[PDB]
């Protein structure tokens, strides 16, 4: 049961903005994707455990923080209309690579 607190987020270009995740049911490592009609799921960082953070396929332009299992936040200091998709958080923790996606958070970077 993964939770994406705010479903609709908006921001002005060049403005810090964070995306938080929470997961009832301890599933050690979490993730951080961005839905973009053209290329699916596409991951940007993710952590193995509480204090870890590892780059993904789309790192740079973002920053990730795993303050402590359960919650996992993805930070965007200095927004950009380039990062105006849907951010999906997901957890998991066994072989088979079964990932559990949250409901999603739509981000619109106003600017231009």
């Amino acid at each position: 049961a993964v939770t994406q607190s705010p479903r609709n987020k908006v921001a002005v270009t060049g403005g810090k903005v964070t995306l938080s995740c929470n997961q009832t049911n301890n599933h050690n490592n979490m993730y951080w994707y961005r839905q973009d009609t053209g290329h699916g799921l596409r991951l940007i960082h993710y952590s193995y455990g509480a204090g870890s953070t590892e780059k993904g396929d789309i790192p740079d332009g973002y920053k990730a923080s795993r303050p402590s299992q359960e919650n996992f936040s993805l930070i965007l200091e200095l927004a950009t209309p380039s990062q105006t998709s849907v951010y999906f958080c997901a957890s998991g923790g066994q072989g088979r690579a079964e990932q559990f996606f949250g409901p999603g958070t739509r981000l619109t970077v106003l600017g231009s």
Binding site: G38, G40, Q94, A97, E98, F101
Partner: protein
């Protein structure tokens, strides 16, 4: 990387739906498929490992071919409601999936 040829599809509440996938990294083992329902999050749905060459779970079936790294999931009696985006994922890392780009399908009924 992963590729899905299908991309955007429509079928008659009937026929078989075939969505194709492909990958290159020979490091890859085990490939699950996820299906996203319009306006909702992705969820798993019928996965396979190169060990075998087929897997069934209802009308959902995956056909896998070793080199010439092609994979393809078949939906039988493609019914409306099966319309989703259908993502093809591949891997080999113990949870962590490298995702394809998906192929949105919609089954017109009646």
């Amino acid at each position: 990387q992963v590729r899905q040829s299908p991309q955007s599809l429509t079928v008659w509440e009937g026929e078989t739906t075939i969505l194709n996938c492909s990958y290159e990294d020979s490091t890859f083992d085990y490939f699950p498929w996820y299906r996203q329902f319009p306006g909702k999050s992705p969820a798993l749905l019928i996965a396979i490992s190169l060990v075998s060459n087929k897997k069934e779970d209802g009308r959902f079936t995956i056909f896998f071919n070793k080199r010439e790294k092609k994979l393809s999931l078949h939906i039988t009696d493609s019914q409306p409601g099966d319309s989703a985006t259908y993502f093809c994922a591949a891997t080999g890392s113990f949870n962590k999936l490298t995702f394809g780009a998906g192929t949105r399908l919609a089954v017109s009924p009646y």
